[PDB]
Design a protein around this motif. Structure first.
Motif, mmCIF file in Angstrom:
data_model
loop_
_atom_site.group_PDB
_atom_site.id
_atom_site.type_symbol
_atom_site.label_atom_id
_atom_site.label_comp_id
_atom_site.label_asym_id
_atom_site.label_seq_id
_atom_site.Cartn_x
_atom_site.Cartn_y
_atom_site.Cartn_z
ATOM 1 N N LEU A 11 18.377 16.311 -11.107
ATOM 2 C CA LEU A 11 17.634 16.966 -10.038
ATOM 3 C C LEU A 11 16.377 16.157 -9.687
ATOM 4 N N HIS A 12 15.524 15.894 -10.682
ATOM 5 C CA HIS A 12 14.353 15.037 -10.477
ATOM 6 C C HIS A 12 14.783 13.662 -9.964
ATOM 7 N N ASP A 13 16.068 13.362 -10.111
ATOM 8 C CA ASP A 13 16.656 12.171 -9.519
ATOM 9 C C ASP A 13 16.839 12.422 -8.046
ATOM 10 N N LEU A 14 17.905 13.144 -7.724
ATOM 11 C CA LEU A 14 18.229 13.535 -6.357
ATOM 12 C C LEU A 14 16.971 13.774 -5.533
ATOM 13 N N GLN A 15 15.959 14.357 -6.162
ATOM 14 C CA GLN A 15 14.757 14.763 -5.446
ATOM 15 C C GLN A 15 13.925 13.594 -4.939
ATOM 16 N N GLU A 16 13.867 12.526 -5.731
ATOM 17 C CA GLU A 16 13.201 11.292 -5.321
ATOM 18 C C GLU A 16 13.964 10.528 -4.218
ATOM 19 N N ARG A 17 15.291 10.505 -4.308
ATOM 20 C CA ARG A 17 16.117 9.926 -3.251
ATOM 21 C C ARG A 17 15.784 10.568 -1.907
#
Lengths: 89, 89
Positions: A11-17
């Motif tokens: 999520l903290h991934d997807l969110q930066e993208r």
């Protein structure tokens, strides 16, 4: 537990993208929009200016030729007017 | 005329790109925006359920231990009334 921790990193991934893409559609996708206009305006300006150049060159050509023909007639005038005056010794 | 036709492709090529982006923005960026949210929702819903499960299993555990200490005390009563009655026989 294990299942969560993992997904969170995604999520903290997807969110930066999604936030980089929001950085792009406001910095990158704007240099390209300003530029497209610059290019399109330059191109259209030129197309229209070549249509001037051309139309102008054509106009003065007509005028030259008109003037030439008038001059060849003024030649005839000159010669014949001189023949008249001469004949009256 | 030569140098124009050239850059015209350049402006057409840059125009196609700029049209994709405003479409991927509005159909793929927005699809990843839905998913981020559901991932975030699910993640949060699971954390609250875990906490809620913990809160309840704990509650049960004193509601249970409190009442086991009681059963022991009631047992002592059973035995003390037994001996009292027995001795007045």
């Amino acid at each position: 537990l294990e299942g969560l921790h993992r997904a969170e990193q995604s999520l903290h991934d997807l969110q930066e993208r999604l936030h980089k893409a929001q950085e792009e559609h406001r910095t990158v996708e704007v240099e390209k929009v300003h530029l497209e206009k610059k290019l399109r305006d330059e191109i259209n300006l030129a197309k229209q200016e070549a249509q001037r150049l051309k139309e102008l060159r054509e106009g003065t050509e007509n005028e030259r030729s008109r003037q030439k023909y008038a001059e060849e007639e003024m030649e005839q005038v000159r010669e014949a007017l001189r023949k008249a005056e001469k004949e009256l010794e």
